[PDB]
Amino acid sequence: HMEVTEEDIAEIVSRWTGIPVSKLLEGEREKLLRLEEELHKRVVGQDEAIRAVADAIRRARAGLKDPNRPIGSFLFLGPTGVGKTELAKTLAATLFDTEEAMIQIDMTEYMEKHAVSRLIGAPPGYVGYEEGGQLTEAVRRRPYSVILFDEIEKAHPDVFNILLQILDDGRLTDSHGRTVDFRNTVIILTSNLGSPLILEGLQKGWPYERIRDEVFKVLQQHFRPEFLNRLDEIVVFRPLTKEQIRQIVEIQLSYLRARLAEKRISLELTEAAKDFLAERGYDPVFGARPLRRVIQRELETPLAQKILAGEVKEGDRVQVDVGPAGLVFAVP
Ligand SMILES: Nc1ncnc2c1ncn2[C@@H]1O[C@H](COP(=O)(O)OP(=O)(O)CP(=O)(O)O)[C@@H](O)[C@H]1O
Ligand SMILES: [Mg+2]
Numbered sequence: 001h002m003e004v005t006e007e008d009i010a011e012i013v014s015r016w017t018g019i020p021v022s023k024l025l026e027g028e029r030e031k032l033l034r035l036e037e038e039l040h041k042r043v044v045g046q047d048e049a050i051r052a053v054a055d056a057i058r059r060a061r062a063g064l065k066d067p068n069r070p071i072g073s074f075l076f077l078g079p080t081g082v083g084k085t086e087l088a089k090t091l092a093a094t095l096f097d098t099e100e101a102m103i104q105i106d107m108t109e110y111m112e113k114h115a116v117s118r119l120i121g122a123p124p125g126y127v128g129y130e131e132g133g134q135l136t137e138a139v140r141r142r143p144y145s146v147i148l149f150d151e152i153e154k155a156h157p158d159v160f161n162i163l164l165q166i167l168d169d170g171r172l173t174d175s176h177g178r179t180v181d182f183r184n185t186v187i188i189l190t191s192n193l194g195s196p197l198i199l200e201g202l203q204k205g206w207p208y209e210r211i212r213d214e215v216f217k218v219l220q221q222h223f224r225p226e227f228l229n230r231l232d233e234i235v236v237f238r239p240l241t242k243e244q245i246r247q248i249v250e251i252q253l254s255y256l257r258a259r260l261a262e263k264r265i266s267l268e269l270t271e272a273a274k275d276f277l278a279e280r281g282y283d284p285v286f287g288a289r290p291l292r293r294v295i296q297r298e299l300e301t302p303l304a305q306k307i308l309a310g311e312v313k314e315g316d317r318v319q320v321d322v323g324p325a326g327l328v329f330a331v332p
């Protein structure tokens with residue numbers, strides 16, 4: 001029907017039921033473009049992680065999974081800054097229409113004995129009883145959510161046990177005795193464990209065998225089969241290739257190009273200029289975390305100066321290259 005669209009009808013049903021539009025339309029959304037391709041618009045590489053997530057969602061939709069557990073659960077190992085959160089955010093926006101559907105719990109904030117009360121609510125008779133838990137209240141308000149637990153090995157054992165309850169039961173009972181349904185959640189657990197150790201061993205000149213033995217020993221110390229067996233998949237994120245970093249540079253320039261387009265200004269970067277940003281914006285210690293401020297300092301700031309001086313004007317095609325002091329700008 002031309003005048004009344006699929007989205008029009010889904011929005012009515014969405015507001016009446018609380019079910020996200022993209023969830024109601026899951027059968028149409030996948031016809032438009034497959035989930036993997038949609039996630040890859042924002043997530044570069046990490047093909048294995050994307051396939052793991054998409055495969056779980058597919059098994060769930062097809063009616064092959066336990067209806068009393070979450071949609072899927074994953075442990076994302078490997079280094080920092082190479083897409084674990086980029087994937088969780090994109091997944092939330094794609095499945096549930098907004099990044100507000102991603103609930104983030106940083107386990108470095110849940111290391112102590114009283115963390116459970118922060119997580120699921122203080123007991124009756126203790127300060128903070130009416131406020132409830134950070135996790136339980138968030139999931140009650142948004143049953144259709146991606147839940148990101150960061151640095152899971154750091155959680156106090158009592159907090160870890162509540163995670164296990166989510167995996168096993170598909171639900172939690174909060175301090176008010178209310179049940180909190182997790183059946184429509186996707187659970188993503190992250191850990192860096194082993195990555196700093198590898199960098200340390202490479203720095204010290206350790207033989208590969210020694211590095212390898214130490215990584216497995218630390219993983220064994222924190223992650224037992226009883227826990228791992230509960231998960232759909234364990235995925236080790238990989239360091240990014242040179243080409244992958246370049247693709248990320250281009251994505252991270254999207255907003256800037258858009259702002260410039262309002263004034264009919266465009267940017268044309270030499271391959272050298274692109275590589276300049278890629279080199280400074282990525283390293284093994286922080287992944288691509290540095291890139292945002294590299295673009296800010298190396299490109300946006302001097303471009304801003306040129307614009308304010310009137311050296312770059314409305315309608316200009318700006319050529320961006322490398323010079324002795326940093327990026328250089330030319331206009332024909
Ligand atoms: N695979 C990828 N695809 C697209 N962008 C990526 C990417 N990996 C990293 N980035 C970029 O670098 C930033 C850091 O990525 P991300 O937040 O996914 O890492 P992370 O969750 O491991 C950091 P932390 O350990 O602090 O949580 C992202 O915001 C994004 O701009
Ligand atoms: Mg993160």
Ligand SMILES: [Mg+2]
Nearest residue numbers: 106108150151
């Ligand atoms: Mg963190």
